[PDB]
Protein: lysozyme
Amino acid sequence: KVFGRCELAAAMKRHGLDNYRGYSLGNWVCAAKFESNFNTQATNRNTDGSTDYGILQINSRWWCNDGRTPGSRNLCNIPCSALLSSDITASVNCAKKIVSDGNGMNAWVAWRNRCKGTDVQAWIRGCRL
Ligand SMILES: [Cl-]
Ligand SMILES: [Cl-]
Structure:
């Protein structure tokens, strides 16, 4: 599923990401835009051989199991394919664990390089929500 911007904002808010670990909704929408272009089916291989999955490009080195990332943890205890669903519940539950790991949203490199410090409220502009 390719979410619309406000469509994704409402889903994320319903699932409790707005102000989760102090990060406003616009931060999460901005991260999803640059990680996946709002596409739940996005997958991208990393140079270390792990893969990033879904709307928030959650990585198989630590968070989900894809069976092809040697030395991997599965801290969200979920198959990585479950992060590609049209329902974002699993991705959000897993993202809450990631953002609680110590470095906040800097865990998403695209958030640090493209969202951090910017006017992230623009990402929820016009949304009813
Ligand atoms: Cl915001
Ligand atoms: Cl923080």
Q: What stands out?
A: The longest helix spans residues 25-36. The domain at 1-129 is CATH 1.10.530.10 (Lysozyme). The beta strands are 43-45, 51-53, 58-59. Residues 21-22, 104 surround chloride ion (ligand 2) (CB under 6 Å).
